[PDB]
Write a protein that binds this ligand. Sequence first.
Ligand code: NI
Ligand code: NI
Lengths: 110, 110
Amino acid sequence: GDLHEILHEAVPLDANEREILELKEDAFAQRRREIETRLRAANGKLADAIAKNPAWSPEVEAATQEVERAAGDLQRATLVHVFEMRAGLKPEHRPAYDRVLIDALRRGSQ
Amino acid sequence: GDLHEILHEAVPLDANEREILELKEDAFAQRRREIETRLRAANGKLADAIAKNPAWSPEVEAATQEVERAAGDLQRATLVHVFEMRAGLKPEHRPAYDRVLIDALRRGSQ
Ligand code: NI
Ligand code: NI
């Protein structure tokens, strides 16, 4: 279900590809961490709101929206980076990458 | 991570609660199935779009938005039903329910 991990594990970068993509990989790792931090905080606000008053409320509406926004940010950032990686591949490596990517997407990997 | 399942498993309904909530449980089961069907179809459209052209595109934008919409529908429907169940509990059972619910939410269960 971890799309990014599935790709790095099944179709790992070659020596030159790894060197070329290192900067983008690192930038994505930091971006993912930041979004995940927001997501955990949103989860906490949702739990907090429900602990206070276990019903839909402005606090629950806001927290649920924050959760969904962070989740969407994560989904999009990951897919953009998946396309980044594809751009950094030797053209001849792209078909295997696509096979893994398409199959994983069909299963709902994100 | 399955909030609904976590609750039914850890704080199962008593005999009378189960009888009273049966209709709502069934309605939710059907609603969940319908949303999941939409989600699987959205995942398929996203895979299809990327199989055709592995880049961001109107098709990828539309599919990703459909995925996020279905996921949001699922999150909200589940939480509304979680509150439905709470309303059907004997008042004295609500605190244990809340303990499980709050702890699970903090971990990002949906
Ligand atoms: Ni990567
Ligand atoms: Ni239920």
